[PDB]
Design a protein around this nucleic acid. Structure first.
Lengths: 210, 80, 156, 60, 97, 117, 126
RNA sequence: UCAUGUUGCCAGCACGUUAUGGUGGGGACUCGUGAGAGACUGCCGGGGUCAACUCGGAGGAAGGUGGGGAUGACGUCAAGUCAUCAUGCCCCUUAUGUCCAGGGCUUCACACAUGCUACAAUGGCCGGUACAAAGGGCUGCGAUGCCGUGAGGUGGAGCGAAUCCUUUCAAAGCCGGUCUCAGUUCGGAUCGGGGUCUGCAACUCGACCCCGUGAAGUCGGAGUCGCUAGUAAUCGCAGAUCAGCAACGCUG
RNA sequence: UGUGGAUUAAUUCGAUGCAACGCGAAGAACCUUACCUGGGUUUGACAUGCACAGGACGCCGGCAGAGAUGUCGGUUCCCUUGUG
């Protein structure tokens, strides 16, 4: 299709920041493998609860893992029952002492990935795609200081054999404009008939941030 | 040309073969040298992959290696 | 940038050894694409060789040769009504100078002397006197542009 | 890129020359580098995500 | 003498780290050489971005390797200990040469 | 002049006269002319019969020459065929011997590009 | 003295300047050895050709980067800006006659998928 | 422009005395990059609706979006990717599973495409002159020295490195001599010996080295492509996948 | 060099003007292999869950064997009494 460069893949050195930050001399590949393993470990159980972000920073080789979730209580249930179990699992898997950091997103669903998560869960919930959309789309804009949205979906929508697509735009969302701060979120629901990909572009504003 | 191949399993097989002064068709999987002159008289059934095609070892057999002494590239490419 | 007006051109400096724009344009046209200093040396030695074989200033000899090769009418390749009708057009001085020098270089590299220094010197001489390939091509192009005057009033 | 082939390349070889890359994340053995040890199709997708601390767009 | 070769992927991050190292050195008390940026190091690696054959529209990946040189002269134990005691960014690597 | 049997043309330098021979090439021309004492610049016309004899003896004694290069190249070619080697099989099918391109290129071996129907 | 920085494609020259009988000090060479092309001679002397200071003024050049013609142009630009530094009235004359304007025209960025920048490869579509 | 002197440059200074900033010191200058300034028709004149816009001049390094990049709205062609990956569905579950042996994947009587080499004297051979930057480098640069025709062998300094290796970074170019417009000192095929290294092993199935190879091709037919300035074009260097290289490739 | 056509055990597969053919393939003597010939494993090379024996497995070696694989040589549990 149209060569839409990833807004986070295009303004990663202009407006948005990297999820991970550290320095490594002749140590890059193993750090990448550790990041991939940790992100794979926190993939399904966290997304079922409504996880939003996963940052992995590196202190003096001990630990720095932050997970930003959209609902407290599931990631951290009874004190030590859930958070400590997954912390110990990370300590066993990764050859480091893991002081896992879990923080809660201050608002309801307002991230492009979060909106995609909700949309895909609704589509898997047998609800009217349209409803799901509009509903979750209304539940998308949110983002207090919100200015624009672009909700896209593709794949076997509603379980049909045709890989149909939908596009919805709201307000200013200049993708080309570099002072855009457009958050990108892609999530694929695994329906009984196949898979449905969901794209969310969230244009916060025209701020340069420089 | 520091050192050519020795055919370690084939080397032991050929040593056992010629130490008893008995000539046997060695179903030789090895295909990476006939550099050693002691192979003369041993019917190397070269395992070109499809079968073990016999190859004989001569005096001027040195300088090139054991593999497609029995060809493995069956080719006609024109009508056949 | 055609279709929008006249195209700006790179300015040309005069030769350091000689000091003439025609000399430098000849240098850049004899310039085999990739080397200039060696091409400059070749065109130099060709111009001195023309100098002793003429006894005059090589810049003036090159001017005389260019005048003996400069065209006046050019023929384009416009297709009119599915038939090749040749429309002669008056040549601007810069275009005529470029055509003359391009012909001079093309027939210089054609000659069979030991070096293209000698080949270019001989081409310069044969264009100055009026007995070279460039001069006969100048004659032939004018002959052909005059032989098709019936199509000359199209004014394109 | 069969899981058997992935384990095969991950298993010890009996010769020092049998070792090759066979990018583990996806399974593509060709076009795998040393500085990252991955394939191109996964490299682009990881890089566009911003999770890599330092890679960005080049423009000079 | 201690050659604190601090290296960071961001010019402003390394600039701030070098300034904080210089300020810590000055507060404890030691000589400081002005910030000397090492030139760069650049690797250009190209990628054919396509699940299959699409040789058109490749993409080349870069990285910024900013290096600052502050040649701290006459260090002190309260400076050397503070060198490794705290490093808030933890994204700037210090080579002690 | 007179040599092993490869002509030395009237307007070729001594190394240049040598370079034509299968036995001697430009680099071997330089080597031989340095070992014997003949200039790489002097012509075949400026050559001396005593120098001819000395040069012929030196090349036939210390260099693989026309006959020596033939008895080397072709004998070892047929040697690698007679051992069944695929270098020999590259030779047989008109292929480059080191396994380089035979699919479309290698015309000097298989023969020029052609055209089938 | 006064030093001038002449920047070329990748040829940058730092030149010390001093009034005196015209001298031309390169990196261990004179002017008649570094530029045997007999063309860059008047090219580099062009700032000295314009304002008559070829022999009344001096040049101690130290070059870094670039090649023969590029360092010739870098030395030429050093001469021009040096003439600016010596006589302020030389700057308007050089600007009017054409000087003191650097050329950003360098070998441009190579475009991916092309043999050279602004060079599409030859092709024959089927 | 400010800052900035180390590993870097070295005018202003000394010490090298050969090995060059190389060294002590030197911020002065790039250089090195942190910040900033500086093209915004900034000023003026001219048409134009008194408007845009346009032209021209001037200040200006940049002039009329400075330049080079980085910008893919809506959608476009079931183009391509279940062999990057998951994926709905079908099939085997004891095989299409599965490890290994060997081969092929490099095979060729050809068609096409793309390139290097040429087809020369602008050049071939031989020798001398001076300039690149980016780099890349820890089991990698790996040098000096040497055996070596030359691979290659030692060998490890300085080297996680503006320091040391890549040469104190080239080639084309400059010069001198030859060659004398030719199957040529073109041009390299082509293969043979012997080795040389990596590699368990280089026949398919690496490359290189000493030698020799001297073909076609004497600038290309129909027809065709690219290129608006650092552009066409030439030459050289480096980087990646690379233990060995098919790379004349790709990225610069 | 790659593609098409043809052999082949494979000459792996797809891509077939734009948008295939100096392509995925920024690297095929084993490997890459996806193909074939042949020899082994078969809850399998790889795993997960239920057991059931269990204190062994598993390792360091020898041998045969193209090698997979198999033979055993020697170690033989660490929990804490439920058994893991």
């Amino acid at each position: 299709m149209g060569q839409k460069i990833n807004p986070h893949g295009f303004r990663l050195g202009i407006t948005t920041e990297w999820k991970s930050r550290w320095y490594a001399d002749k140590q890059y590949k193993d750090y990448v493998k550790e990041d991939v393993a940790i992100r794979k470990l926190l993939a399904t159980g966290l997304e079922r609860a409504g996880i939003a972000d996963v940052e992995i920073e590196r202190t003096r080789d001990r630990v720095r893992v932050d997970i930003h979730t959209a609902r407290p209580g599931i990631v951290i249930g009874r004190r030590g029952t859930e958070a400590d179990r997954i912390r110990a699992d990370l300590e066993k898997l990764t050859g480091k002492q893991v002081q896992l950091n879990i923080l809660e997103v201050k608002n309801p669903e307002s991230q492009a990935q979060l909106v995609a998560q909700g949309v895909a869960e609704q589509l898997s919930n047998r609800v009217a795609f349209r409803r799901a959309m509009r509903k979750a789309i209304q539940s998308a804009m949110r983002q207090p200081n919100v200015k624009g949205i672009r909700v896209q979906c593709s794949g076997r929508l509603g379980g049909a054999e045709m890989s149909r697509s939908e596009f919805y735009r709201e307000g200013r969302v200049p993708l080309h404009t570099l002072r855009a701060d457009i958050d990108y979120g892609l999530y694929e629901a695994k329906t009984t008939f196949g898979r449905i990909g969901v794209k969310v572009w969230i244009y916060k504003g025209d701020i340069v941030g420089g | 040309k520091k050192g050519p191949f020795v055919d370690d399993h084939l080397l032991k097989k050929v040593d056992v073969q010629n130490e008893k002064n008995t000539k046997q068709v060695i179903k030789t999987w090895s295909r990476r040298s006939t550099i050693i002159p002691d192979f003369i008289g041993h019917t190397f059934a070269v395992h070109d992959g499809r079968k073990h095609v016999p190859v004989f070892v001569t005096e001027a057999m040195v300088g090139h290696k054991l593999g497609e002494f029995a060809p493995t590239r069956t080719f006609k490419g024109h009508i056949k | 940038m055609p279709r929008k007006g006249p195209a700006p051109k790179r300015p040309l400096v005069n030769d350091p050894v000689y000091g003439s724009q025609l000399v430098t344009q000849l240098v850049n046209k004899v310039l085999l694409e990739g080397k200039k200093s060696l091409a400059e040396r070749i065109v130099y030695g060709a111009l001195e060789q023309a100098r002793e074989k003429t006894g005059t200033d090589p810049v003036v000899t090159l001017k005389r040769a260019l005048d003996n090769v400069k065209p006046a009418l050019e023929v384009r390749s416009r297709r009119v009504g599915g038939a090749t009708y040749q429309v002669p057009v008056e040549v601007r001085p810069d275009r005529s100078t470029t055509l003359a020098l391009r012909w001079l270089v093309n027939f210089s590299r054609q000659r069979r002397e030991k070096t293209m220094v000698e080949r270019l010197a001989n081409e310069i001489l044969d264009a100055s006197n009026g007995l070279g390939a460039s001069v006969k091509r100048r004659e032939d192009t004018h002959k052909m542009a005059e032989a098709n005057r019936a199509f000359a009033h199209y004014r394109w | 890129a069969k899981k058997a082939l992935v384990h095969k390349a991950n298993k010890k070889p009996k010769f020092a020359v049998r070792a090759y890359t066979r990018c583990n994340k996806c399974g593509r053995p060709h076009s795998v580098y040393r500085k990252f040890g991955l394939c191109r199709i996964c490299l682009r997708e990881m890089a566009h995500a911003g999770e890599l601390p330092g890679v960005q767009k080049s423009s000079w | 003498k201690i050659r604190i070769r601090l290296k960071a992927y961001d010019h402003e991050a390394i600039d701030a780290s070098a300034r904080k190292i210089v300020e810590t050195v000055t507060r404890t008390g030691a000589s400081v050489v002005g910030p000397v940026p090492l030139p760069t190091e650049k690797n250009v690696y190209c990628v054919i971005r396509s699940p299959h054959k699409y040789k058109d529209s490749r993409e080349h990946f870069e990285m910024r390797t900013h290096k600052r040189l502050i040649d701290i002269l006459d260090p002190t134990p309260k400076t050397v200990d503070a060198l490794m005691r705290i490093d808030l960014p933890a994204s700037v690597d210090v080579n002690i040469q | 002049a007179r040599l092993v049997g490869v002509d030395l043309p009237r307007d070729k330098r001594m190394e240049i006269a040598l370079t034509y021979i299968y036995g001697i090439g430009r680099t071997r021309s330089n080597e031989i002319l340095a070992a014997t004492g003949i200039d790489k610049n002097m012509r075949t016309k400026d050559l001396t019969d005593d120098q001819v004899t000395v040069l012929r003896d030196y090349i036939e004694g210390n260099l693989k020459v026309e006959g020596d290069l033939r008895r080397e190249v072709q004998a070892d070619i047929r040697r690698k065929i007679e051992i069944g080697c695929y270098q020999g099989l590259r030779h047989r099918r008109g292929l480059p011997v080191r396994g380089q391109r035979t699919k479309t290129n290698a015309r000097t071996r298989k023969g020029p590009k052609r055209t089938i129907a | 003295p006064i030093q001038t920085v002449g920047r070329r494609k990748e040829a940058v020259v730092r030149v010390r300047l001093v009034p005196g009988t015209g001298q031309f000090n390169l990196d261990g060479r004179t002017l008649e050895n570094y530029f045997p092309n007999k063309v860059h001679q008047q090219l580099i002397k062009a700032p000295l050709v314009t304002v008559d200071r070829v022999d009344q003024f001096d040049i101690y050049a130290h070059l870094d980067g670039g090649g023969p013609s590029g360092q010739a142009g870098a030395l030429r630009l050093a001469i021009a800006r040096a003439l600016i530094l010596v006589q302020p009235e030389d700057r308007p004359a050089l600007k009017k006659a054409g000087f003191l304007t650097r050329d950003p025209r360098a070998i441009e960025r190579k475009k991916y998928g092309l043999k050279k920048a602004r060079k599409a490869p030859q092709y024959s579509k089927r």
